[PDB]
Amino acid sequence: KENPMRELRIRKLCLNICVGESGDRLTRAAKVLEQLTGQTPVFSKARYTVRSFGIRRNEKIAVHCTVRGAKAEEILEKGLKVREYELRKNNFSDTGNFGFGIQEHIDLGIKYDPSIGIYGLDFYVVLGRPGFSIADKKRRTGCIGAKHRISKEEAMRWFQQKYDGIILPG
Template sequence: MSEPKQNPMLNVKINKLCINCCVGESGEKVNRAIKVLQELTGQVPSVGKAKITIRGFGIRRNEKISAFVTVRGQKAEELLHTALKVKEYEIKSSSFTPEGNFGFGIKEHIDLGIKYDPSIGIFGMDFYVVLDRPGTRVAKRKIKKAKVGKQHRVTKEEAMKWFTEKFDGVIINK
């Protein structure tokens, strides 16, 4: 006999990939970070503002200090693949959340294959991957909302298993 069929509703997939580039000051530096993210993703990034004033960092409330972009679908998978190639497909186990999401950082954007431009400089960025299963829309839709059952939510262990199977990744226990 053949293998038992697996339920397609239990397949884990990438919901979105959030890329954040926090420069910590407003002005030209944020504009250069926006250019880097736009070149990387092909989308127009949003600008993040400071929530509170921190005198030690020289940041004022509502000052533009970061740029971020959310990528979904096939493009998210391609970008994640190139970013993990920089990290050599190694992620710490502490990078995974109990909800099944994970994140990591890259110190230089030129490692992703973007050509270095002296007028822009070098930026580091954070990648955050949100995983889910088909059917999680019932918790987010406007009409007839319902809860997603505990059995159907992605756990930390399932996210780690998905990462090792999909990308042949290595999880470092630290």
Template sequence: MKAIRVEKVVLNIGVGKAGEPHEKARKVLQELTGQKPAARAARESIRDFGVHEGEPIGVIVTLRKAKAIEVLKRILAARDNKVNTRSFDNNGNFSFGVKEHIEVPGIRYNPDIGIFGFDVSVVLGRPGRRVSSRKRARSKVGLSHRITKEEAVAFAQKHLGIEAVE
């Protein structure tokens, strides 16, 4: 009941503008995950950057279960399985970035698309964590059932083969 597992892996590319770069970023995530990415719209207009509210400026894809672990291991190989310990938060989640998507094994450079970097966020949880996020009969997760930073680092090292660096 207290076994830690990967709840989800979220990949995000913040392009910053709509149009052709947005479509290219969509193709990158599609190729990387085999799943259709969702567009993320700007929450507010920023005149200096030429961004308008509601305009799609990013793409995101959420992976769960076995597919999440498989894609995560491929992405970690691009970083030599190294993640900084400061990337782990106090709730047992961790995030890191990849500067170029072509560093991921199995991805080839396509001159029509170019090179994109992306962010990866991994959410860890235990069975029963859903009580804090469901709509009906919501309650808090007890302190003994929450994941600490040390537990998250130990899980990542043992099950994902991550080398935690300072």
């Protein structure tokens, strides 16, 4: 048997692009990201100052956004279609989440505009389960127990069964 609603569902999908310098490149990356995600993304300032990468304290160097639900699985479907539903054993974290990256963006269904240029990005997905909001709600916060959490094997099974993908070793 099974519990009808202890099943696995994706609860958020995070997209980010880290360009490493503020300016026209940054705002065009924000533009392509918001065109892809249908909503305005946000800028993240540099935490520290390191001159090896040519960055300083508190300038926007990356643009990221998060999605839930319908648009989340559509974007994830596009990304996995680009990655031909192929992932590696080490692509999955110990907490049940996973992710990957796309070297360039116009392949997943984005028209090439010569002005904006080309940009890669990182997809990440946080596998969830009904009741995970306990860990972050305000009134009576608590843990999510031991049985209810997600492990690497469960994430692998969910990925290979729902999206009929292949986990090549590596």
